[PDB]
Each structure stands twice: as structure tokens, then as C-alpha cells.
Amino acid sequence: AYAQWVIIIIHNVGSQDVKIKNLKASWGKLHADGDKDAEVSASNYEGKIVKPDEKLQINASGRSDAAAGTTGTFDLVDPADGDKQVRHFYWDSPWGSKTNTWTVSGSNTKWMIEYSGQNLDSGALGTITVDTLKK
């Protein structure tokens, strides 16, 4: 159901590029900014580069009246250093549970990753802003 949604804004505040990979929405759909009806494909972001000082918005939502919610994962990798993984993100705004999940895992001492805005107590997962900076 559209009531279960998440917006992930990857904002590259560093000076070197960061690439997205393995963007997979297990549940729900990816859609366009401000229009849950205008569904889009994961290919729109796969292997995309977020250049320094550039923002990239990913919108995910549950399907209409679907009683399913949304859930997905994606990796941030370093285009330099042979696509070495920077972080792995998993998000889940479930329809059947009052607890949302937003977990960032992985270790890469060459990158600083901060995130904020997520809601976990109840309702949608909210708008999550992620700032990435390669040291």
C-alpha cells in the first residue's frame, strides 16, 4: 500500500565519485519523485554514478491496496579501487508490522557515511538522507 513508503537521498558531499549497485526491491516498487503511480525500473539507478555535490533520490513504495509494504537493498561501491564495497543498505517498511528497518552494514575506513531522517516506531519509513564522503 502506498502508505508504506521510503525516500533515500544519497548526497555525495566528498570529492570522488560513488557508484550504486545491486539495487533490488524485493517488495513494493520504485517510482518517480512525488508520483507513486509513475513506476520506474531498478535499471534507472543500477551502476549509476553520484558525482561530488550531486544528489540522487530513490523512491520506494508499496503497491496500491497491496497489503505488502516495501523492502529492498543496495550497495554503495567505490568506482575507483575496483568497485570495492563502501556500504550495504537494507530498508524495510512493512505493512504487517509496526517496526520499520533501516540497516547500514559493511566496513570501509576510506569512507565516512552518515544518515538521518528514518522513522522506526510506526507508519512509513520516512525520508532518509545519506551523506557520503571519501577521505
Partner: protein
């Protein structure tokens, strides 16, 4: 006739003088807005003979250059050392544009490639005063008189204007080793991301360009499907048609002067006068991991500062040595407030750079922002960051010079501060540069 070499030409006074005159071997090169062009005035006295070697091995030679304003130098077949010696003058006198295709960002790189199909005849050498040999070149008395007249002016500004005119007439460099013969040249520029393997890109471009020149098509496609625009230059067609096909050494015209005059001229050619002053901590900004310092007190009239620094001891003030004149690139540029959702300055003149992000609200109509200036691109070299702070929102870079063994490339350690993450949007590019020490004259009494 057939079988003649440079030796036969040099032994004949008529043919030797024709070779000297048709190649402007007695003239300096003016590294100006139109590229390296010979001066119309003779810089040295005509020699009685030329030192030469014979070489007839025709072949294709490829070179690459990564400096920004060296396209026309590459098109003239300067080698790496000559390009390095000539780059400061070209950069200072070049025409800057914000729409240049050359990119030198921290993620993207650009390079010029040149392939020369050479039919050589030999090489000619000139003896500079620095070498102790007795066949040294002699500066023409007209040039020496011009230098003396320039240095005899009452005021430093008059002397500097006279020297600028003199070097615009006689040139900035003199070719000391030149190659003779014929050459078909092809030139191109390529931009690629730094994540790619540089060796493979260079090899692919080299293969494409060498194939283009060998079969000699304004556009070429390489093995990696790289779309290259190629500029072709013909310098082929008998000793009457031999021309300069390569420059393997150039000496700055100032370096040909006697030492007591050479030092004075080199000092007078420095774009800026420097001065150390006391600093003062910027109020507020307690959230930042380091203290921010600005020049203390009012800036003396006619002097300018270069940005906020982490150095608590002293700050550098600079003053232009040459007045502003149309057709001449100023040493310093003013800054203007940004358009939206930013309080950071923007350089008024394209391709100029400032060293620090502004910690506050920049206003170009009131102090201390009315005396903050950017720098001409020939004044600065890339620095190195060192980060302070535990979080992105509070982290700040302090920029330090890149250590070099040769003092010629030393840069000031101003400890310029660059905020890691500027709030808002539409902010300028982040400074990552340091000021060259050779551009600033200290203790000049002016």
C-alpha cells in the same frame, strides 16, 4: 647537391645564413596570446658558425602532456623540458574561458597527445652563458640597451612596465637546441575519468594517432571507440626547405643576462609583493574543530589577503606589481556573492582560483570581503588536504603544500581552511590549491 647534409649547409656562409634566417634562429619566442610565435627582432648576435649533428632516421614519435595551457606548445613540437620551461609564460598570457574543454578535476583528467612523423636532418645547438664554454651566444646590443633603459626608470612600476614591453617585443624564451628537417604532425586532446587505467588509455590514443599520421581525416576512432578530433600540421617541402621540426631545449631570455642584472630582472618580474601581518581569531565558529584566523586590523590600502587560514601566527598580504591594462591578465581577481542558497564568493574572471572557503557571509562591498582576492591560474599549484573533525557537518580540510625536492616548485604553507561540507546548494568548487613562492617578492621596500 644530392647527399648534402647540415654540414654542407653550415660550411657555406650563404646557405648557413639562409638556414639561420628562414628559421628565425636568432630570435626569441613570444609566449603570448596567439601561442609560441617568433619575435621579429634579433635577440643574439649572428654567429660565425653553428654547432650541429647529423641525423636522418625518419620515424613516428608520440608525446603526451598533462598541463592545461600547453596545447599550442605541443603543436610546435616542444619536448617535455621545453614545455615545462615555457608553461609559466603561456599560462600568464593565455586567454581564459569558462567553457574550456580541458578538465583537471580530482575525478576527471585531460591530456594532449601529439604524433610527429619526422624526416630529420640533424640538430643545431647554442651555447648559453650558464655553461662555461667559450662559444657562448652574445646578446644583441639593442636588447641589452633595452634592458638597461628599463632598469633605469625612476619608479618600480615604470621599470616593470618597460620590462613587460621589452619581453613582449623580444620574447620570453630562446630555443637552444632545435631539430631540422621535415615533419607531419597530428595533435589531439582526450579527457577520461581517473578511475580508468591510464596506461591503456594512453596506448589506445597513441595507436589511433600514429595510425592517423602514418596513413596521411579530421576525426578518428580508436580501438576503445574513442572519438578523437585531430589537427594536422604540414612542415614538409633539398636544403632550401629544411625547417625547425622540434625543440628539445629552451632557456628563458632573462636567464641569458649577466647575473647582477639577471637577479634584478627576475625580481622585478614577480607578479606580487608579499607582506606578513598579524592574525586574529574569527568570532563564533566554536563548532569547528579548528580555529579560524583572518588578518588583524584594517588591510593597508592597495593590499589584499587570500583567505581564512588555520595558522595562528601570521597571514600573507599580496599587492599587484603591474597596473591593470586591457589585454593583460591581472594577477588578482575580485570575488562576487553567489546566486542562491550560498554565501560563498565566486571568482569574477574565469579560471582564477581562491584558496579558502569563506567562514561567514561574504560581501564584496564591505571589509574584509572587499579586499579578498583570487589568483591567476599560473600562481597556484594543487595542494594536499588534511582533515580535522569527527563528523561530516563539522569536518574541515587544512591544505598543505605538496613537498617537492626542487625549490622552484615550493608553495607557501598558508594552512588555508576549506570546509568539507558547505551548507546550502549552489556552492562554488572547493579550493584545493596553494600559492607558489616564486610569484611573491618580499622585502622590496615598496
Amino acid at each position: 647537391q644530392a647527399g648534402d647534409t647540415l654540414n654542407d649547409v653550415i660550411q657555406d656562409p650563404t646557405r648557413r645564413n639562409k638556414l639561420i634566417n628562414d628559421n628565425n634562429l636568432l630570435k626569441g619566442i613570444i609566449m603570448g596570446r596567439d601561442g609560441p610565435v617568433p619575435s621579429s627582432r634579433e635577440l643574439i648576435v649572428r654567429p660565425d658558425t653553428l654547432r650541429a649533428i647529423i641525423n636522418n632516421r625518419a620515424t613516428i614519435e608520440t608525446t603526451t602532456m598533462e598541463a592545461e595551457f600547453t596545447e599550442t606548445l605541443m603543436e610546435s613540437n616542444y619536448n617535455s623540458a621545453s614545455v615545462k620551461v615555457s608553461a609559466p609564460f603561456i599560462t600568464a598570457n593565455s586567454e581564459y574561458s569558462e567553457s574550456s574543454s580541458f578538465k583537471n578535476t580530482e575525478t576527471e583528467k585531460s591530456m594532449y597527445t601529439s604524433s610527429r612523423y619526422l624526416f630529420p636532418q640533424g640538430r643545431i645547438d647554442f651555447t648559453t652563458p650558464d655553461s662555461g664554454f667559450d662559444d657562448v651566444i652574445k646578446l644583441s646590443p639593442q636588447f641589452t640597451s633595452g634592458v638597461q633603459a628599463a632598469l633605469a626608470k625612476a619608479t618600480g612600476t615604470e621599470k616593470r612596465e618597460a620590462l613587460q614591453n621589452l619581453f613582449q617585443e623580444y620574447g620570453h624564451v630562446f630555443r637552444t637546441k632545435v631539430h631540422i628537417g621535415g615533419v607531419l604532425s597530428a595533435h589531439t586532446m582526450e579527457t577520461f575519468s581517473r578511475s580508468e587505467n591510464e596506461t591503456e588509455v594512453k596506448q589506445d590514443v597513441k595507436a589511433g594517432l600514429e595510425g592517423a599520421v602514418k596513413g596521411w581525416q579530421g576525426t578518428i576512432t580508436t580501438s576503445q571507440n574513442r572519438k578523437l578530433n585531430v589537427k594536422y600540421i604540414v612542415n614538409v617541402v633539398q636544403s632550401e626547405h629544411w625547417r625547425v621540426i622540434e625543440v628539445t631545449e629552451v632557456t628563458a631570455v632573462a636567464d641569458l643576462l649577466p647575473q647582477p642584472i639577471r637577479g634584478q630582472v627576475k625580481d622585478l618580474l614577480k607578479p606580487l609583493l608579499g607582506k606578513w601581518v598579524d592574525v586574529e581569531k574569527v568570532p563564533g565558529l566554536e563548532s569547528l574543530p579548528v580555529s579560524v584566523y583572518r588578518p588583524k586590523g584594517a588591510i593597508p590600502a592597495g593590499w589584499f589577503w587570500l583567505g581564512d587560514t588555520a595558522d595562528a601566527s601570521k597571514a600573507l598580504l599580496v599587492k599587484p606589481t603591474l597596473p591593470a591594462r586591457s589585454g593583460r591578465n591581472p594577477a588578482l581577481t575580485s570575488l562576487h556573492q553567489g546566486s542562491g542558497m550560498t554565501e560563498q564568493p565566486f571568482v569574477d574572471l574565469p579560471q582564477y582560483q581562491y584558496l579558502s572557503t569563506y567562514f561567514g557571509s561574504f560581501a564584496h562591498d564591505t571589509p574584509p570581503g572587499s579586499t579578498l582576492r583570487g589568483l591567476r591560474p599560473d600562481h597556484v599549484l594543487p595542494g594536499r588536504y588534511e582533515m580535522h573533525g569527527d563528523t561530516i557537518s563539522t569536518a574541515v580540510y587544512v591544505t598543505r603544500p605538496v613537498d617537492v625536492p626542487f625549490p622552484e616548485d615550493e608553495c607557501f604553507d598558508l594552512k588555508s581552511l576549506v570546509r568539507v561540507k558547505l551548507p546550502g546548494s549552489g556552492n562554488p568548487p572547493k579550493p584545493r590549491s596553494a600559492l607558489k613562492k616564486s610569484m611573491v617578492l618580499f622585502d622590496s621596500g615598496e
